[PDB]
């Protein structure tokens, strides 16, 4: 479980793995990127980490309540801030129901755009409160995140173009996949261009995916080449 | 707090930062690489992570007891394995006296004449594991930031100087990404059969070569990134 | 005790053994033309039988939430959790449940209920759940089952899985209770009890066993150098 | 962690994975098959599962005590049965010292003057011995790989096929539980040979292993497809 | 996290750092100086300390409610005092919803046309105090390191540029002594009656003047120390 | 309440204020610097902060036991480390008997013949940390006001007299910024290998040199500020 | 925080300190004597003690509302009793809004034309009492230290100049005895039927007369003690 | 209830009132100065404040246990420090029994045991305690603030015994005049250094000539000093 989200001037980039810990001996594939879409009006992405029972319930309840117009839901919230308030309430609702402790805890990332607004990205905590990405901290990570953090800090900034933000996300994934076996393919990624309200750039990245293979091989080879040509060690 | 140690065919490489959390409003610099040296006979290195009160006491006890020939100490143990057994005992002794608040992790590496290079990781519980050709390095403290470069370029047959280059790059990525890790560094190269502590160095913010390799690595990465083939998710 | 449930595009397949250490490990909550719910049990027998009995007894009370008047399978899963927690609070006794079936107005849904009373739902990415002594029978499921596998081949997969389990672990034993639930059918017709004398089960086991021995002998010779 | 050892009429076959759980967020590669060899006189194989620190200490102690003739060790114990008792004592010694800390071990090989013997040593230090009717032992994550062994292995199965059976068992296990992983360490011990030459490291790039996995998988899918149609009525 | 505000006769001076603790392994840069601006009419500065989720919700709710003319907001309150009461209400609202773990402190300083400069310190309870000529500045966050130079050099009558200087030296000493406080900085000079936000600046580690003033202060101090009379106890 | 101790290459420097909060409406003057000295053999300094009942009891018990040769005391401990352990043990003894209300912090520094200068910070839990060359000083009590000047000029190699000057300045800024700290002061300079407590001093409101250095420092700060480069942010 | 008010035959005398604790570790200077003056028609003095946020809100609300003739305010109330009532109402208003730790005490004194001098003590609950000839003064804050001198020398008929002397001696003893009370002071003499704030003063540490009255009282007192008859309790 | 004790170079001075609140409508006279005496060997004085029932049970238990040589008691403790420890144990003892802050008390314990100097303690309701030093040479319990200013301006560690008792009486007089919870008769005592005697112990009644004398002299003395002060120059 590793999800990352980036809020840039030109749009948002999302990447999630799918390797999930369901039990003592139950390691399986679950989608960790879900969409709430009203074409021409809103595009919302929810990413999951932590207890699978908890996050599946949060997504299911949200999806179900989207069908009830007499209730506050992700289709009739006026802004991304209200979506975050709503996500947080649902987090408390599900955790308190399942509880009798940190066992049922989750973290969520919520990102997107509602027509009438700019891009917004939030990190929701188990307590139900949340923080918002700014230009100074333009990305969020949830799950096993430290292996993939150094490359984002090296190359991502608020003004990084979308395609490069996504290359950065994939490289971040590559380093994580290589270093921690709790994170695993397939991947689910998405690029959201500003004011597009489009879900066309949604992709599942498997091991057989030709481009992910190439960027991994190219990056790896580039690094090994940089390393070999480093000037000789002079510690004295 | 981040320490790494590497056991290679030609020797050992050690790198430790010095930034320490002693109390919350008390974050300062403490050395996390200590030496037990017998010129021509043994070279043993201890790296510290976790509770500062606990690690300092363990090291002091080991240091005070090296001066007493009538008890087991790091100067009279016969193998690195007995050295590990002794460290393990002392951990349990210090933690049991002071009382996960008082927990520590240690790295123990070097050579005692008559045997090859050995490197151990000691746990709070006092048990330990040993580095092999398949898993030839250990990290303690805030280690994940710095792990990918090691997995990408380090193996048992990496020459000492490149292993040290790898450690420094590992530190660089850690320094950039987590503020609980901080300069100065204390690093050391132990060439096989040398029983020397001569290549022990303190790396400060002004160190010319550390500055150069960080800059060289960073610029190298930025260029590799820029030259990558265009995104094709379609 | 070993139970398996599969959620495919075209329907659901369930298989449970019955040896305990005979008790039913597959229960039906049936309303013809409206809903078909299957509950499977593994783990502490006292706990599981208590949970199942409360649920059945409450089906007789329409003024209470029960498996006959829940609006969706999601609510069915929520109810099961409440009952799990209710029994826990009242009284190690680990239990696991599988909940699968269909309520009209909704598609096929499948849940794994945990001892803590929380639960997960099967997806296209993870289209089956196992409870009980499950490791012996997992490799064949991974080899041949995917979300779009036909019901009959899914049931064949489940049976071979039982076979490997029956052969390897003596706490799992005949008879079997199995069921094929076709999409939108709301039927319990393809529910069957499989005993030692069942002709087709005998057939697939010998058929499967012989094939594997045949592939094995036909393998290219060992070359480890 | 998954280790299997097979005792046959013609020899022994051993297969171990190497994926190891050393600590929280520390899954690494460690060899789980170690050898105690006396050319022309003795060949002993020890396979490890469970707590890495415990098993490593046991192996290290055994290796170190082999250098001392004034002490009971795996070089001077008279039979495999005495070797098993020796392992068991060492298990208890290390566990009591380090005290969760539990391990399971497999012990197999031949001491000159005796036939092949194979033992499974438990964390309490006791042990059981392989027979002709139950001609293999497994430790670690073993259930996934058990059915294929029961279907095709017997006391009289030749060594090459026994090793093939181990490899398929490893394959179903690798595919089904991510705690088990490549590289592998395997070994074939021919009866009366006292040789350690047929020991191998199998990495992901190993051609025959790539081949046998591909061959077995395709075969299984063919048998499944050629099965008679479902008849539950 | 360290923010300071100074209310002087010729204007207001503000300085904020950006190092923030969002989670254990999440120390990041967040801006801690926010503006509510109506050209020619009002300029309001809000500084943040304490829980980030909490302070961001407070600022965001206020920003959103400014777009609603039918509701009390920072654009239609008549005095800086009503602004402060409004802040306190938003503080209690956020704390109640999200739940000292969620506690925050705020500084509110600025000017509404028809009134002089006003500066408030808002507490986690939603009540507040106001700066006077006797107590002309407030600090929030990690404040003790930087207090001695302010008490030493600042008074109600200090010219604006010297007040900003005091702030920068205050900041330097804090940076030098406590690692929870960190660059970049956000600073602002508000001259009396200007209703202007032009003099707002981001100070990075590369900022030429900040390097200069730190250097001058540091060498000046080291020279003062050396020229001290020899110790006579 | 503010205490600071510095361990330098040439000796140790100590300074403590005296303003103590003993009760709800009872803030009075109490000594926070106590000496255990055996001429020509040992000089040990203890500084106290936290609950007055607790620290006064710890000091009296240590003094009581110094008169009994049949039990471990500060007069017969072999190293400063065993002394720290003894302090930590006495802290736990008093806290448990009297019982965060009873908590205290202590500083312990000095020299025992046969070893170098050693300085410890003892925590209420009874464990402790040791000063090193990288962190050559400790503060207890109200310490943040007085830390920056120390970080600016103090180093392991600062000559003794300057270390004391730095301490007095630190004390001055604290006195000025927080009313829980107050004159008189009790200070001491311990030169390495001297084993003398001859340089212990009480600094009152009337102390001439302290008056001179305060006004001298204050005037100096104002002059430097004024000669700073003019503000240019545009 | 210490405030006193005296209602005498010839007028009123007021004195307050300024030391305020606004939060933990935030002890600073705040005015605790505020004026509401209508030249030739009213002179009202409000003195503050307790929670600063509470008292500052009370005074600010009162000041703002004086600018609103459409509302009851301290400028259009007919008598000091109506003023006390309004003050009590505002006390409840701020305390109920902000919500025992938001509590404050206030003194309200002066004269509104058409009635004589009046002085009130307003409590946190919003009710109040009024000074009479038998109890001609009120104190708020840290008051016990400065009470004996008032009881010994103050009466309803004490002249204004002597009354202020008593208040100053009351402060001196308090300043010397409790560190929550501190300079500068704000004092005022209000002569009967004057309606003037001409006699409003800030007393600093450098204030010539205050230094004189303090030294003079202190010196004289020590002299009295020396002239007492020898102790003979037997 | 007001008790004060002074520890000086030449001896100790004690003074206590007797007015006690035993119930809301039960305000009575009870002695608040008790003696534990061994002629030629020790003199201990215990002074009482707070809950009478608690205070009476403590003093009685100490008196009763003074009759049992097989138990730790105030007659066989080696030092005053051991006596304070004993009182604290008894304070906690009585409070835990009676509770199954209403039952809280404060105590003063002062005197001399042969072989030791003068010692004075203030015992807290928690059973912990502090000791008087040269820096704080007296303690007060009960309603103490009215009487604190005269002691601060007149008492020092080197103050002779007679002037110290005089200082205590004036302190009592001011308290009497300012607070109705404190009342005559008084119980006072002067203990000269190394005397181990209870002869200078006195009951001071309303009719006591010398106290009547010292009150009138001081009252007149103050009023005259007030009268000759320079006129207001604000
Ligand atoms: Cl609902
Ligand atoms: Cl020892
Ligand atoms: Cl890397
Ligand atoms: Cl009257």
Author numbering:
A (entry chain C): 1 to 100, 107 to 242
B (entry chain D), F (entry chain F), G (entry chain G): 1 to 99, 108 to 242
C (entry chain A): 1 to 21, 29 to 98, 109 to 242
D (entry chain B): 1 to 99, 109 to 242
E (entry chain E): 1 to 99, 108 to 241
H (entry chain H): 1 to 100, 108 to 241
Article, verbatim:
Anbu shares distant sequence similarity with 20S proteasomes and even more distant similarity with HslV. The threonine, lysine and aspartate residues that form the catalytic triad in HslV and 20S proteasomes are conserved in Anbu. Based on the scattered phylogenetic distribution of Anbu with occurrences in cyanobacteria and proteobacteria, it has been suggested that Anbu may represent an ancestral form of the 20S proteasome or HslV. Anbu predominantly occurs in an operon of four genes in conserved order.
A YbAnbu V14A/G107H variant was more stable and was therefore used in all experiments. YbAnbu exhibits the β-sandwich fold with a characteristic four-layered architecture. In Anbu, the C-terminal helix is much longer than in 20S proteasomes and appears to play a major role in multimer assembly, as it mediates intersubunit contacts in the particle. All three residues are conserved in YbAnbu (T1, D17 and K32). The (putative) S1 pocket is smaller in YbAnbu than in HslV and 20S proteasome subunits due to altered amino acid composition, and other conformations of the β-hairpin region (residues 17–31) and (putative) catalytic lysine residue (K32). In YbAnbu, the hairpin connecting the β2 and β3 strands (residues 17–31) would collide with the P2 and P3 residues in “canonical” position. The basic building block of the YbAnbu particle appears to be a protomer built from two subunits tightly bound to each other, in part by interactions between the Anbu specific C-terminal helices. The YbAnbu protomers are then further assembled into a left-handed helical staircase. Instead, 7 protomers or 14 subunits assemble into a twofold symmetric lock-washer shaped particle. The YbAnbu structure reported in this work differs from all other helical assemblies observed for Anbu by its much smaller rise.
